[PDB]
mmCIF file of C-alpha atoms (C1' of nucleotides) and ligand atoms in Angstrom:
data_model
loop_
_atom_site.group_PDB
_atom_site.id
_atom_site.type_symbol
_atom_site.label_atom_id
_atom_site.label_comp_id
_atom_site.label_asym_id
_atom_site.label_seq_id
_atom_site.Cartn_x
_atom_site.Cartn_y
_atom_site.Cartn_z
ATOM 1 C CA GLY A 1 -23.741 36.707 -1.932
ATOM 2 C CA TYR A 2 -25.134 34.568 0.003
ATOM 3 C CA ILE A 3 -23.282 31.281 0.924
ATOM 4 C CA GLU A 4 -22.279 30.751 4.592
ATOM 5 C CA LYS A 5 -20.179 28.403 6.195
ATOM 6 C CA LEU A 6 -19.323 28.292 9.827
ATOM 7 C CA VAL A 7 -15.547 28.339 10.172
ATOM 8 C CA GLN A 8 -15.451 27.896 13.811
ATOM 9 C CA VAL A 9 -16.937 28.695 16.936
ATOM 10 C CA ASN A 10 -14.913 28.972 20.081
ATOM 11 C CA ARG A 11 -15.234 29.493 24.207
ATOM 12 C CA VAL A 12 -13.143 32.128 25.922
ATOM 13 C CA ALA A 13 -12.943 33.619 29.449
ATOM 14 C CA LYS A 14 -12.281 36.398 31.315
ATOM 15 C CA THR A 15 -11.024 36.565 35.040
ATOM 16 C CA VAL A 16 -12.930 38.921 37.646
ATOM 17 C CA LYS A 17 -13.772 38.985 41.119
ATOM 18 C CA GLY A 18 -16.037 36.463 41.605
ATOM 19 C CA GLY A 19 -14.876 33.739 38.908
ATOM 20 C CA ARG A 20 -14.930 33.607 35.001
ATOM 21 C CA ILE A 21 -17.141 35.452 32.418
ATOM 22 C CA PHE A 22 -17.413 33.130 29.171
ATOM 23 C CA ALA A 23 -17.729 34.337 25.832
ATOM 24 C CA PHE A 24 -17.965 32.558 22.513
ATOM 25 C CA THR A 25 -16.292 33.585 18.991
ATOM 26 C CA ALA A 26 -17.213 32.468 15.961
ATOM 27 C CA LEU A 27 -15.316 32.844 12.665
ATOM 28 C CA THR A 28 -17.308 32.692 9.111
ATOM 29 C CA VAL A 29 -16.888 32.939 5.286
ATOM 30 C CA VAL A 30 -19.354 34.585 3.071
ATOM 31 C CA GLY A 31 -19.113 34.975 -0.663
ATOM 32 C CA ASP A 32 -21.684 34.444 -3.810
ATOM 33 C CA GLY A 33 -19.374 31.616 -5.295
ATOM 34 C CA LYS A 34 -18.265 33.256 -8.246
ATOM 35 C CA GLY A 35 -15.692 35.892 -7.566
ATOM 36 C CA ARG A 36 -16.056 37.731 -4.102
ATOM 37 C CA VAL A 37 -15.409 36.590 -0.587
ATOM 38 C CA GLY A 38 -15.133 38.019 2.646
ATOM 39 C CA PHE A 39 -14.640 36.692 6.131
ATOM 40 C CA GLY A 40 -15.745 37.774 9.611
ATOM 41 C CA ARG A 41 -15.234 37.450 13.293
ATOM 42 C CA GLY A 42 -18.080 37.902 16.154
ATOM 43 C CA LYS A 43 -18.071 37.532 19.850
ATOM 44 C CA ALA A 44 -21.057 37.725 22.336
ATOM 45 C CA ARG A 45 -22.340 35.962 25.114
ATOM 46 C CA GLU A 46 -24.698 33.833 23.373
ATOM 47 C CA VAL A 47 -23.751 31.359 20.455
ATOM 48 C CA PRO A 48 -26.258 32.708 17.932
ATOM 49 C CA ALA A 49 -25.664 36.295 18.284
ATOM 50 C CA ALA A 50 -21.782 35.821 18.138
ATOM 51 C CA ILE A 51 -22.486 33.833 14.362
ATOM 52 C CA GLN A 52 -24.992 36.881 13.528
ATOM 53 C CA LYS A 53 -22.170 39.343 14.102
ATOM 54 C CA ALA A 54 -19.898 37.239 12.482
ATOM 55 C CA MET A 55 -22.301 37.044 9.241
ATOM 56 C CA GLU A 56 -22.538 40.814 9.639
ATOM 57 C CA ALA A 57 -18.887 41.820 9.711
ATOM 58 C CA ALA A 58 -18.165 38.970 7.118
ATOM 59 C CA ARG A 59 -21.025 40.522 4.469
ATOM 60 C CA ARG A 60 -19.048 43.761 4.466
ATOM 61 C CA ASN A 61 -15.640 43.989 3.373
ATOM 62 C CA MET A 62 -15.686 41.594 0.679
ATOM 63 C CA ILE A 63 -12.915 41.382 -2.517
ATOM 64 C CA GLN A 64 -13.384 40.616 -5.948
ATOM 65 C CA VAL A 65 -11.041 37.647 -6.785
ATOM 66 C CA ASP A 66 -9.750 36.768 -10.404
ATOM 67 C CA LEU A 67 -9.811 33.524 -11.159
ATOM 68 C CA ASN A 68 -9.442 31.420 -14.358
ATOM 69 C CA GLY A 69 -12.864 29.519 -14.890
ATOM 70 C CA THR A 70 -13.519 27.620 -11.211
ATOM 71 C CA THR A 71 -9.721 27.418 -11.188
ATOM 72 C CA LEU A 72 -6.343 29.340 -9.986
ATOM 73 C CA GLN A 73 -4.361 31.280 -12.493
ATOM 74 C CA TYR A 74 -0.873 29.806 -11.244
ATOM 75 C CA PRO A 75 0.772 28.549 -7.792
ATOM 76 C CA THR A 76 0.416 30.938 -5.119
ATOM 77 C CA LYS A 77 2.200 30.732 -2.056
ATOM 78 C CA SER A 78 1.330 32.911 0.967
ATOM 79 C CA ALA A 79 2.266 33.900 4.474
ATOM 80 C CA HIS A 80 0.455 35.434 7.693
ATOM 81 C CA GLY A 81 2.305 35.320 10.975
ATOM 82 C CA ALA A 82 3.482 31.688 11.712
ATOM 83 C CA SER A 83 0.610 30.220 9.052
ATOM 84 C CA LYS A 84 2.114 29.428 5.101
ATOM 85 C CA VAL A 85 0.217 28.250 2.486
ATOM 86 C CA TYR A 86 0.926 26.648 -0.774
ATOM 87 C CA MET A 87 -1.768 26.669 -3.575
ATOM 88 C CA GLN A 88 -1.678 25.315 -7.387
ATOM 89 C CA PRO A 89 -4.233 25.318 -9.887
ATOM 90 C CA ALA A 90 -5.434 21.560 -10.875
ATOM 91 C CA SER A 91 -7.444 19.633 -13.436
ATOM 92 C CA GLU A 92 -11.004 19.504 -14.218
ATOM 93 C CA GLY A 93 -11.772 16.238 -12.979
ATOM 94 C CA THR A 94 -10.499 17.251 -8.918
ATOM 95 C CA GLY A 95 -12.114 18.442 -6.553
ATOM 96 C CA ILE A 96 -10.923 20.723 -3.283
ATOM 97 C CA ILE A 97 -8.220 19.121 -2.117
ATOM 98 C CA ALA A 98 -7.498 21.171 1.238
ATOM 99 C CA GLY A 99 -7.771 21.299 4.801
ATOM 100 C CA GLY A 100 -10.500 22.756 7.296
ATOM 101 C CA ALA A 101 -10.702 26.504 6.721
ATOM 102 C CA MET A 102 -9.026 26.538 3.570
ATOM 103 C CA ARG A 103 -11.709 24.156 2.480
ATOM 104 C CA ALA A 104 -14.061 26.506 3.414
ATOM 105 C CA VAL A 105 -12.494 29.882 1.750
ATOM 106 C CA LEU A 106 -12.085 28.279 -1.289
ATOM 107 C CA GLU A 107 -15.099 26.596 -1.851
ATOM 108 C CA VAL A 108 -16.991 30.398 -1.115
ATOM 109 C CA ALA A 109 -15.006 32.118 -3.675
ATOM 110 C CA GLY A 110 -15.761 30.246 -5.970
ATOM 111 C CA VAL A 111 -12.770 28.103 -6.995
ATOM 112 C CA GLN A 112 -13.408 24.069 -7.499
ATOM 113 C CA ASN A 113 -9.509 22.589 -8.330
ATOM 114 C CA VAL A 114 -7.260 24.148 -5.686
ATOM 115 C CA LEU A 115 -4.760 21.177 -4.756
ATOM 116 C CA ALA A 116 -3.779 23.282 -1.631
ATOM 117 C CA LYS A 117 -1.672 22.933 1.371
ATOM 118 C CA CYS A 118 -0.650 24.214 4.615
ATOM 119 C CA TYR A 119 2.709 24.300 6.665
ATOM 120 C CA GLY A 120 3.379 26.219 10.133
ATOM 121 C CA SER A 121 0.791 26.864 12.604
ATOM 122 C CA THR A 122 -2.895 25.578 11.418
ATOM 123 C CA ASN A 123 -4.589 28.119 13.297
ATOM 124 C CA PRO A 124 -7.648 28.407 11.467
ATOM 125 C CA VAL A 125 -8.364 32.846 11.604
ATOM 126 C CA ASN A 126 -4.849 33.044 10.857
ATOM 127 C CA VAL A 127 -5.108 30.427 7.697
ATOM 128 C CA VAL A 128 -8.026 32.373 6.845
ATOM 129 C CA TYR A 129 -5.787 35.906 6.734
ATOM 130 C CA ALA A 130 -3.343 33.709 4.992
ATOM 131 C CA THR A 131 -5.471 32.174 1.973
ATOM 132 C CA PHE A 132 -7.189 35.871 1.576
ATOM 133 C CA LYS A 133 -3.562 37.295 0.920
ATOM 134 C CA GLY A 134 -3.067 34.754 -1.175
ATOM 135 C CA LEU A 135 -6.265 35.005 -2.954
ATOM 136 C CA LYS A 136 -6.259 38.842 -3.113
ATOM 137 C CA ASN A 137 -2.695 39.514 -4.947
ATOM 138 C CA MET A 138 -3.607 37.074 -7.794
ATOM 139 C CA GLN A 139 -3.267 39.191 -10.867
ATOM 140 C CA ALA A 140 -4.531 37.168 -13.844
ATOM 141 C CA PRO A 141 -3.557 38.288 -17.844
ATOM 142 C CA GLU A 142 -4.608 41.360 -19.156
ATOM 143 C CA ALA A 143 -3.425 43.090 -15.821
ATOM 144 C CA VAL A 144 0.059 41.775 -16.004
ATOM 145 C CA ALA A 145 -0.288 42.908 -19.569
ATOM 146 C CA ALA A 146 0.805 46.719 -17.949
ATOM 147 C CA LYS A 147 4.322 46.405 -19.565
ATOM 148 C CA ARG A 148 3.275 45.998 -23.406
ATOM 149 C CA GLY A 149 0.557 44.798 -25.537
ATOM 150 C CA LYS A 150 -1.358 41.241 -25.337
ATOM 151 C CA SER A 151 -0.662 37.766 -26.336
ATOM 152 C CA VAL A 152 2.874 38.114 -26.887
ATOM 153 C CA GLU A 153 3.539 38.327 -23.125
ATOM 154 C CA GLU A 154 2.043 34.451 -22.318
ATOM 155 C "C1'" G B 1 -3.859 8.318 -30.285
ATOM 156 C "C1'" A B 2 -1.923 6.640 -25.377
ATOM 157 C "C1'" A B 3 2.138 5.810 -22.032
ATOM 158 C "C1'" C B 4 -0.596 10.618 -16.213
ATOM 159 C "C1'" U B 5 -3.741 13.599 -13.564
ATOM 160 C "C1'" G B 6 -0.768 15.382 -8.381
ATOM 161 C "C1'" A B 7 -0.295 17.687 -2.280
ATOM 162 C "C1'" A B 8 -6.333 17.626 3.890
ATOM 163 C "C1'" G B 9 -5.544 17.728 8.895
ATOM 164 C "C1'" A B 10 -7.372 16.788 14.356
ATOM 165 C "C1'" G B 11 -6.400 15.953 20.176
ATOM 166 C "C1'" U B 12 -3.442 17.523 24.174
ATOM 167 C "C1'" U B 13 0.413 22.535 28.241
ATOM 168 C "C1'" U B 14 -3.510 27.679 30.115
ATOM 169 C "C1'" G B 15 -8.564 31.175 34.160
ATOM 170 C "C1'" A B 16 -8.241 32.655 28.640
ATOM 171 C "C1'" U B 17 -5.068 33.908 24.022
ATOM 172 C "C1'" C B 18 -0.832 33.218 19.985
ATOM 173 C "C1'" A B 19 3.909 30.881 19.288
ATOM 174 C "C1'" U B 20 7.324 26.898 20.483
ATOM 175 C "C1'" G B 21 7.779 21.796 20.904
ATOM 176 C "C1'" G B 22 7.150 16.938 21.925
ATOM 177 C "C1'" C B 23 3.629 12.659 22.601
ATOM 178 C "C1'" U B 24 -1.238 10.639 20.279
ATOM 179 C "C1'" C B 25 -4.813 9.791 16.374
ATOM 180 C "C1'" A B 26 -7.494 9.142 11.208
ATOM 181 C "C1'" G B 27 -3.926 5.833 5.375
ATOM 182 C "C1'" A B 28 -1.377 2.024 2.454
ATOM 183 C "C1'" U B 29 1.040 -2.651 3.292
ATOM 184 C "C1'" U B 30 3.393 -7.799 5.066
ATOM 185 C "C1'" G B 31 6.168 -14.776 3.819
ATOM 186 C "C1'" A B 32 2.905 -12.834 9.674
ATOM 187 C "C1'" A B 33 0.862 -14.500 14.535
ATOM 188 C "C1'" C B 34 -3.001 -14.736 17.953
ATOM 189 C "C1'" G B 35 -8.831 -14.433 19.494
ATOM 190 C "C1'" C B 36 -14.013 -15.304 17.936
ATOM 191 C "C1'" U B 37 -16.370 -16.905 13.309
ATOM 192 C "C1'" G B 38 -16.616 -19.906 9.514
ATOM 193 C "C1'" G B 39 -20.202 -22.249 2.248
ATOM 194 C "C1'" C B 40 -17.681 -22.390 -2.808
ATOM 195 C "C1'" G B 41 -14.054 -22.039 -6.256
ATOM 196 C "C1'" G B 42 -10.408 -19.879 -9.999
ATOM 197 C "C1'" C B 43 -4.583 -17.702 -9.492
ATOM 198 C "C1'" A B 44 -0.888 -17.676 -6.343
ATOM 199 C "C1'" G B 45 2.111 -18.438 -1.446
ATOM 200 C "C1'" G B 46 3.540 -21.442 2.597
ATOM 201 C "C1'" C B 47 10.365 -22.979 8.792
ATOM 202 C "C1'" C B 48 11.381 -15.227 8.405
ATOM 203 C "C1'" U B 49 13.781 -19.472 13.877
ATOM 204 C "C1'" A B 50 19.112 -23.805 14.920
ATOM 205 C "C1'" A B 51 24.410 -23.368 8.031
ATOM 206 C "C1'" C B 52 20.919 -27.589 15.153
ATOM 207 C "C1'" A B 53 21.274 -33.017 14.936
ATOM 208 C "C1'" C B 54 18.764 -37.132 11.548
ATOM 209 C "C1'" A B 55 15.442 -43.232 11.517
ATOM 210 C "C1'" U B 56 13.344 -44.842 6.171
ATOM 211 C "C1'" G B 57 12.860 -44.756 0.823
ATOM 212 C "C1'" C B 58 13.845 -42.245 -3.406
ATOM 213 C "C1'" A B 59 16.775 -38.226 -6.608
ATOM 214 C "C1'" A B 60 22.594 -40.245 -12.526
ATOM 215 C "C1'" G B 61 22.858 -42.961 -15.900
ATOM 216 C "C1'" U B 62 23.399 -45.022 -20.638
ATOM 217 C "C1'" C B 63 25.892 -47.926 -24.628
ATOM 218 C "C1'" G B 64 25.824 -54.803 -27.372
ATOM 219 C "C1'" A B 65 26.011 -51.238 -34.014
ATOM 220 C "C1'" G B 66 33.326 -50.439 -29.463
ATOM 221 C "C1'" C B 67 35.028 -55.713 -26.713
ATOM 222 C "C1'" G B 68 35.976 -60.392 -24.969
ATOM 223 C "C1'" G B 69 32.992 -63.974 -22.072
ATOM 224 C "C1'" A B 70 28.551 -67.103 -20.368
ATOM 225 C "C1'" U B 71 23.160 -67.056 -20.887
ATOM 226 C "C1'" G B 72 21.840 -69.563 -24.154
ATOM 227 C "C1'" A B 73 15.268 -69.436 -26.977
ATOM 228 C "C1'" A B 74 11.956 -70.486 -32.006
ATOM 229 C "C1'" G B 75 13.615 -73.541 -35.585
ATOM 230 C "C1'" G B 76 16.035 -77.208 -39.239
ATOM 231 C "C1'" G B 77 16.688 -81.567 -38.023
ATOM 232 C "C1'" A B 78 19.180 -87.263 -36.341
ATOM 233 C "C1'" G B 79 18.732 -90.748 -32.924
ATOM 234 C "C1'" C B 80 15.968 -93.929 -29.631
ATOM 235 C "C1'" U B 81 10.800 -93.568 -28.426
HETATM 236 MG MG1 MG C 1 3.693 22.479 15.026
HETATM 237 MG MG1 MG C 2 -8.538 22.649 31.797
HETATM 238 MG MG1 MG C 3 15.775 -21.361 6.817
#
RNA sequence: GAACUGAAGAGUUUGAUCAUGGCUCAGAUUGAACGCUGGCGGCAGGCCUAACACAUGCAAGUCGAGCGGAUGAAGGGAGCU
């Protein structure tokens, strides 16, 4: 998949004798818009190098997400650290009602109707972890049918 | 056949980081007031304060087919003119 979103770019510093060394960190998300999505972090002493490292890292470790035709299966509630995330499917006319990192993640993954919200700390990287944790543990029918036959469970 | 369908975050504590936590901002509303500016129309609204004191007009009268009385037309005439 090839859809690049630059979620965040930040400048960090470390102290040595002489003064400070500055570094640049980038967090990006990659996906095809039809089920696969991954995220990557990259640090360098230059912004382009950090962004390229983040893109290369995100292009690895992609995951497959089960979705109901550009729409979620059921409401989801997922947490990582101090960040908490609520999601729930919406109708066709809706867009993406989400803020910041969540919007990039959901748009990249390929869902178009998400009506989402976040509570707790709104650190973008932790929000991205929480959003992938919610999206990855999404079952969808014919997999919850491990118990018994299908069309009777629903 | 309908009577609903719906939820965004950002800045700021550090050399840098995560968390906690307060402050501030982006929206929608007023019986509003003030500053600058000002063409027209339709529909509404207009003492939120002193239940403070009030000049002057008007805002509750009608019935003569309930009853006496006094006001007494036009006319028919009568006299004198
Ligand atoms: Mg907080
Ligand atoms: Mg500083
Ligand atoms: Mg009054």
